[PDB]
Design a protein around this nucleic acid. Structure first.
Ligand SMILES: OC[C@H]1O[C@@](CO)(O[C@H]2O[C@H](CO)[C@@H](O)[C@H](O)[C@H]2O)[C@@H](O)[C@@H]1O
Ligand SMILES: [Mg+2]
Length: 580
DNA sequence: CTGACTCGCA
DNA sequence: ATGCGAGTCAGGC
C-alpha cells in the first residue's frame, strides 16, 4: 500500500527540524556537476518531497542544509555533498550514513542502494533503485509521482533503520569506526573529488603522438615476423599465430585456449623474435588506450581537471577504490609509463605536488600484530627488510646476499602478506612447489612469531566466523569451514591477509583525518588530491613545502602507535612525476 | 550488454 | 599467493 507524504510546493518550517532522514537524489552514476532530481525529508513531523528548483533556491532550506546542528541521516551522503558543492551549496550535520554503516557491518553484501541495506534488517518497504530507474540504456528518471514515492520510501527506510544499524555496530565495537573514521573521511573524500587534479592535456597529446608512431612501427614489425597481418589485441588470433603458425611451445593454457599473459610470453621470448615485439606492443598499447586516450576522455574540457570518484564502500579489505578515472593505478614502475605522471600538474601557478608514502606499512603491521621478535627488531633497526629476510632464510651475512637472493626473499615477503602457499609462491618464482615450500619453512623458522600468528588467525576466523583489523573493521569468512580444499584455502589466505591490508587501510584513513585537521589549524592552503593505498598526494603553494616536509610525515607516522615505528618517505616537485 | 583475458597500481 | 578498474575482443541478445 502506498506511503503517505506531502508533495510540497514550497519549504515550510516543519521541514527543517533538527533531526531528519534526508534524500538528495542524483541518478547519474558519476555525480560530478550532475543534476539533483528530487529531495525527500522524513522527520518527527512527517514525510515530505520537494522539487530541487524549489528547495535549493529557498534560503531557509539551504541554510538548514549547511547547519551542522541540524542532524541528517542519509545513504551515500558523499554523492549528495559533491553534487551540492558543484552548485555552491554546503551540506553539514550528516550524523549517520546508511551506506557506510552497511559496509562496515558486512562489506560482502555489496550494498549499493537503500533497498539492499534495508533487506539486512528484514525491511522491504522500499524498491531497489535499479527497479525504479532501470539498467543502462534503459535508465531514466520516472515521472514525478513514481519518483516522489521512491525518494520518500528511501528516506522513511533510513529514518527507521538508523537505530538498529547503530545498535549492531555498537555490539560489533564498530560505532567509533563509523562515527570517527568512515563518516568524517567521507567529507574529506568529497573535497578531494570536487577539487580534482589538473591535467596537462597538451603533454598527454604529445605523448599520444609519439606512442602512435612507435606503436605503428612495432605493429608492422610484428606482421613482418608473423608473415601476415592479424589483430594483435586478440588473445585468440595471437594464440593461433604464436602456438600454431610459429609452432611456439604451449607452457600454459587459460581456460578457453592459449595463455598469452606477459609472464608466459617472457618465457617464449628466447624462441622467436616476435615475442619481444608483442610485449613491447602490449606495453605501448596499454599506455596509449588506457592512460592517454582513456584519461583524455574524462578530463573536463573547461577546467582541464579530472574528478575521480572514490568508492568508499566496495572493497572487502577496507581500502578505497577509484573510478572515472582510476587514479590509483597510474604507471610508475617502468619509465616509459612513468612519464604519464608528468601530465598531472598543480592546479595553480607556483604550486607544487607533494607525495608522502608509508615505507613497508604492511610488513610493519604484521610485525605489530604477530609480535614477532625478529621482525620487530628488524624494523626497530630500520633494516632493509628484504635483505634481512634473505639473510635469515638463506643463513648468510649481509655481504653474502646476492641480488637474486634478495629478489626471492622479497617474493617470499609478498607471499607471507598475501597468505602464503607453496603453489602460489612457486608460480611467482617459477620454481618447484617443494622448493617454494622449503623457502616458506625456512621463513617460519626465522620468524616463529609470524608462523604462530598465521596459525592462530586462521583458527580464530574459524571460531568467530570473521577476522578484524586494528580499528575493528571486520570481514566474514564462511568458506573457512568448507570441505573443498581450494575454497577453504582461499578463505585461509584472506584470514591471513585481510587484517594486514585492512589495518593498513585503517591507519592511512586516520592519517587523512588527522592531516586535514592539522592543515586547518595551521591555515595552510595545502590540500589532499589523492590517496593510493599507502600514500597521500597533495598540492600546495611552493611557500608551504618546508612546512609540509615536517608536518605530513609526522601526522602520518603518528596516526596510530604500534610496537614498531611507522616510517614515511616524501618528495615534491613541479608535476606528479617529479614528486620523486 | 556481459564474461574472458589482460595489465596497471599497492 | 591479496584485490581493485578499464580497455579489448568475443559471443549473444
Ligand atoms: O557514489 C558512489 C557510491 O555509489 C555506489 C552505489 O550506491 O556505486 C555507484 O557509483 C559508483 C561511482 O560512480 C559506480 O562505480 C558504481 O557502478 C554505481 O553503482 C557505491 O558502490 C559507492 O560507494
Ligand atoms: Mg611505499
Amino acid at each position: 500500500a502506498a506511503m503517505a507524504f506531502t508533495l510540497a510546493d514550497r519549504v515550510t518550517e516543519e521541514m527543517l527540524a533538527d533531526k531528519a532522514a534526508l534524500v538528495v537524489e542524483v541518478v547519474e552514476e558519476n555525480y560530478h556537476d550532475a543534476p539533483i532530481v528530487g529531495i525527500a525529508v522524513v522527520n518527527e513531523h512527517g514525510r515530505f518531497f520537494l522539487r530541487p528548483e524549489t528547495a535549493l533556491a529557498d534560503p531557509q532550506f539551504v541554510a538548514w542544509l549547511g547547519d551542522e546542528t541540524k542532524k541528517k541521516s542519509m545513504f551515500d551522503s558523499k554523492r549528495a555533498a559533491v553534487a551540492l558543492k558543484w552548485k555552491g551549496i554546503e551540506l553539514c550535520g550528516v550524523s549517520f550514513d546508511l551506506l557506510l554503516a552497511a559496509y562496515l557491518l558486512d562489506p560482502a553484501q555489496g550494498v549499493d542502494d537503500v533497498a539492499a541495506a534495508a533487506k539486512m534488517k528484514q525491511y522491504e518497504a522500499v524498491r531497489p533503485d535499479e527497479a525504479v530507474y532501470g539498467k543502462g540504456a534503459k535508465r531514466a528518471v520516472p515521472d514525478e509521482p513514481v519518483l516522489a514515492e521512491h525518494l520518500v520510501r528511501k528516506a522513511a527506510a533510513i529514518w527507521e533503520l538508523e537505530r538498529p544499524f547503530l545498535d549492531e555496530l555498537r555490539r560489533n565495537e564498530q560505532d567509533r569506526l563509523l562515527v570517527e573514521l568512515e563518516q568524517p573521511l567521507s567529507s574529506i573524500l568529497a573535497e578531494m573529488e570536487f577539487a580534482g587534479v589538473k591535467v596537462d592535456t597538451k603533454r598527454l597529446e604529445q605523448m599520444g603522438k609519439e606512442l602512435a608512431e612507435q606503436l605503428g612501427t612495432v605493429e608492422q614489425r610484428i606482421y613482418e615476423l608473423a608473415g601476415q597481418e592479424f589483430n594483435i589485441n586478440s588473445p585468440k588470433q595471437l594464440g593461433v599465430i604464436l602456438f600454431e603458425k610459429l609452432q611456439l611451445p604451449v607452457l600454459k593454457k587459460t581456460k578457453t585456449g592459449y595463455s598469452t599473459s606477459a609472464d608466459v610470453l617472457e618465457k617464449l621470448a628466447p624462441y622467436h623474435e616476435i615475442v619481444e615485439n608483442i610485449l613491447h606492443y602490449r606495453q605501448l598499447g596499454k599506455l596509449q588506450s588506457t592512460y592517454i586516450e582513456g584519461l583524455l576522455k574524462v578530463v573536463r574540457p573547461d577546467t582541464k581537471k579530472v574528478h575521480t570518484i572514490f568508492n568508499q564502500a566496495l572493497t572487502q579489505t577496507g581500502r578505497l577504490s577509484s573510478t572515472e578515472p582510476n587514479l590509483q593505478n597510474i604507471p610508475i614502475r617502468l619509465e616509459e609509463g612513468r612519464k604519464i605522471r608528468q601530465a598531472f600538474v598543480p592546479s595553480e601557478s607556483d604550486w607544487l605536488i607533494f607525495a608522502a608514502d608509508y615505507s613497508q606499512i604492511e610488513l610493519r603491521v604484521l610485525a605489530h600484530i604477530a609480535e614477532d621478535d625478529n621482525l620487530m627488531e628488524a624494523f626497530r633497526r630500520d633494516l632493509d627488510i628484504h635483505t634481512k629476510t634473505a639473510m635469515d632464510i638463506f643463513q648468510v651475512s649481509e655481504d653474502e646476499v646476492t641480488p637474486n637472493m634478495r629478489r626471492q626473499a622479497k617474493a617470499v615477503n609478498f607471499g607471507i602478506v598475501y597468505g602464503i602457499s607453496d603453489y602460489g609462491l612457486a608460480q611467482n618464482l617459477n620454481i618447484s612447489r617443494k622448493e617454494a615450500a622449503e623457502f616458506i619453512e625456512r621463513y617460519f623458522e626465522s620468524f616463529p612469531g609470524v608462523k604462530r600468528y598465521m596459525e592462530n588467525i586462521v583458527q580464530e576466523a574459524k571460531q568467530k566466523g570473521y577476522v578484524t583489523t586494528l580499528l575493528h573493521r571486520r570481514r566474514y569468512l564462511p568458506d573457512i569451514t568448507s570441505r573443498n580444499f581450494n575454497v577453504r584455502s582461499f578463505a585461509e589466505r584472506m584470514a591471513m591477509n585481510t587484517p594486514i591490508q585492512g589495518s593498513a587501510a585503517d591507519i592511512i584513513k586516520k592519517a587523512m583525518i588527522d592531516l586535514n585537521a592539522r592543515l586547518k589549524e595551521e591555515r595552510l592552503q595545502a590540500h589532499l588530491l589523492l590517496q593510493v593505498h599507502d600514500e597521500l598526494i597533495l598540492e600546495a603553494p611552493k611557500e608551504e613545502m618546508e612546512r609540509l616536509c615536517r608536518l605530513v610525515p609526522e601526522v602520518m607516522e603518528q596516526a596510530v602507535t604500534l610496537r614498531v615505528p611507522l616510517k614515511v618517505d616524501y618528495h615534491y616537485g613541479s608535476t606528479w612525476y617529479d614528486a620523486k
